[PDB]
Design a protein around this nucleic acid. Structure first.
Length: 104
DNA sequence: CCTGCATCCGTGAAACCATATGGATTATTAAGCAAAGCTTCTTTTC
């Protein structure tokens, strides 16, 4: 899960901003009060510190009240589900028959 | 010199040679593209 996140980010993160990053990429332009709501274990300035890291890294930014990742963090998520497909859903990553097509 | 008349000017109702030259035009090809067509997964029927 966050193994693929922090591993896919080359360990630039910790688990707090990992699951917060799952929350931000999970619903587009959500409020940080919902982030603190689904993270009751973390403090208000702990969540705001982790958003200070993602803003500090420039991944998650605002749109007025908006909160969303950029495309590079999106590539980190898609690599995370890629390795999650390599190790957790192996037959989901498959391929069917391919047409040639035409023969002389 | 300055008063006094005249006027008059405005003002409206050839051909060629040569030499670059580059920009304009044409051809030629790589990319791409919409449309078609396999391949498998559901969906509907008896």
């Amino acid at each position: 899960k966050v193994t693929y996140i922090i591993k896919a980010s080359n360990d630039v993160l910790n688990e707090k901003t990992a699951t917060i990053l799952i929350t931000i990429a999970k619903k587009d332009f959500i409020t940080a009060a919902e982030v603190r709501e689904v993270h009751p274990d973390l403090g208000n300035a702990v969540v705001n510190s982790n958003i200070g890291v993602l803003i500090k890294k420039g991944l998650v930014e605002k749109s007025g009240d908006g909160l969303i990742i950029t495309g590079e963090a999106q590539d980190i998520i898609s690599n995370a589900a890629t390795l999650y497909a390599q190790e957790n859903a192996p037959e989901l990553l498959k391929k069917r028959a391919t047409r040639k097509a035409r023969e002389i």
